[PDB]
Every structure is written in structure tokens, then in C-alpha cells.
């Protein structure tokens, strides 16, 4: 017998393999795993890791946020492992070179009209194998509604978690425990 943590086996956490059986995504994962192995590039390693992530961890990036993040590098290209969505709040776009998994039709048309272009990750590997002049970006991973219910339970003091309710009227979870007039608040 030996006194070892976890009986002596190193335990990793998170994804180990691609779950999606999408042949194109599998080819892309193969290519970028090879790139990350054969080059020293943390850029390629990060892209290979992110291509594996679940849907909730490759969130969409809006055009406005893309342009805002790319504002200070007009000559480099922006690499997003999620999707690029159009933003109607943005008035004008300006010449963006962006590689991404997928582009919504409106975002694609807007980028092309602005004169930049949309790239796939195979083209990104072909033209920038080590990520020169390439800025890795990701959308808000914690902005989704599911996260609003997480953390401290709604009912703990100073908790910002939304409760699970059928509706949010005056007569749905608003009386005792949410105001001083009925027992306590929060």
C-alpha cells in the first residue's frame, strides 16, 4: 500500500475530445491539433482547445463588440471561435478582417459591404499558421440567462440570482421574504 492522493493518478478536468460528430468540425479539430502540436504556438493551442468547447462556451460576438475590440488594431485580423451576429444598434462598420466559425447572413453581408472579409479556420490556418497579426477574441460567456439563476440561491442575503417562476407579476414570489412588510426581505 502507498499513501497517495487519488491513488496516484493525475486527474484532469474538462473536455478531452470533440463531442460533435460534424465532419467538417472534426477535420478542423484534427488540423488545429496538428498545428498546436507541431508549432509551439499558444495561439494554435488555444484555438484547438476552444474548438472543442460546448456551445455555451463559444458564445456569439456582435459586430459592434468585434469592431470595438479591433478598434486599436486596424491592420490585424480578429479570430473568434464562436459566431458573429449582426448588431442593428451599430450605425456603420469599417473594414474588418475576421475569422470565425460561422457568420450570420446579415453580419456576413454587412462585413462584405464594409469591405472587410469573413474567413474560416482552414483559411486562417493556411494564411496565418502561427497567428501573426491575429487577435483572439471571445464573446460574453457569462451573459446567458442560465447564469442569471446561478451562484448564491435566491433567498440568500444579497443574492442576485433570478428565481424560477412561471410569471413575474405582483402575485408571483413577491410577498414574504422579498419585502420588509412581510416577515423579512431577501
Amino acid at each position: 500500500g502507498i499513501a497517495l492522493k487519488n491513488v496516484g493518478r493525475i486527474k484532469k478536468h474538462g473536455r478531452k475530445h470533440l463531442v460533435s460528430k460534424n465532419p467538417y468540425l472534426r477535420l478542423l479539430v484534427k488540423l488545429y491539433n496538428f498545428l498546436a502540436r507541431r508549432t509551439n504556438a499558444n495561439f494554435n493551442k488555444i484555438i484547438a482547445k476552444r474548438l472543442i468547447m460546448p456551445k455555451r462556451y463559444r458564445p456569439p460576438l456582435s459586430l459592434s463588440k468585434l469592431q470595438y475590440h479591433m478598434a486599436n488594431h486596424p491592420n490585424d485580423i480578429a479570430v473568434v471561435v464562436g459566431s458573429i451576429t449582426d448588431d442593428k444598434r451599430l450605425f456603420s462598420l469599417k473594414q474588418l478582417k475576421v475569422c470565425a466559425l460561422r457568420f450570420t447572413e446579415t453580419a456576413r453581408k454587412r462585413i462584405e459591404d464594409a469591405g472587410g472579409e469573413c474567413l474560416t479556420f482552414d483559411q486562417l490556418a493556411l494564411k496565418y499558421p502561427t497567428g501573426k497579426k491575429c487577435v483572439l477574441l471571445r464573446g460574453p460567456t457569462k451573459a446567458r440567462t442560465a447564469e442569471k439563476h446561478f451562484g448564491k440561491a435566491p433567498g440568500k442575503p444579497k443574492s442576485k440570482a433570478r428565481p424560477y417562476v412561471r410569471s413575474k407579476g405582483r402575485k408571483f414570489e413577491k410577498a414574504r421574504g422579498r419585502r420588509k412588510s412581510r416577515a423579512y426581505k431577501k
Binding site: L31, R102, T120, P129
Partner: protein
């Protein structure tokens, strides 16, 4: 010939699928081994290392 009309090229009123756009691929060209054998990434690859 009617396939193009149905799926968006040279559309007509009662034939083309209204407001339908053909799906777009995740990859531009799936010949990943051609891109790997391209000289641009061949130059970027480090020297082959050895196993245990």
C-alpha cells in the same frame, strides 16, 4: 436545371423557396492535408521530435 431555380439562383415567384439561403460551410476547403502540405505552414512547423 430547375434545381437552381428552386434553391435561389434565377428565382421565380411560385418555384423558388421564399427567402431561403443555402447552408454555408464551416470550412472553406476541407482538404486539410493540402493546407498542411502547403509551404506556408510547412515553414511554420517545428522540427520533428522523438518519443520515449
Amino acid at each position: 436545371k430547375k434545381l437552381d431555380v428552386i434553391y435561389g439562383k434565377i428565382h421565380e415567384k411560385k418555384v423558388t423557396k421564399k427567402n431561403y439561403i443555402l447552408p454555408k460551410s464551416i470550412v472553406h476547403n476541407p482538404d486539410i492535408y493540402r493546407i498542411i502540405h502547403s509551404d506556408k505552414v510547412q515553414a511554420s512547423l517545428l522540427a520533428k521530435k522523438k518519443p520515449c
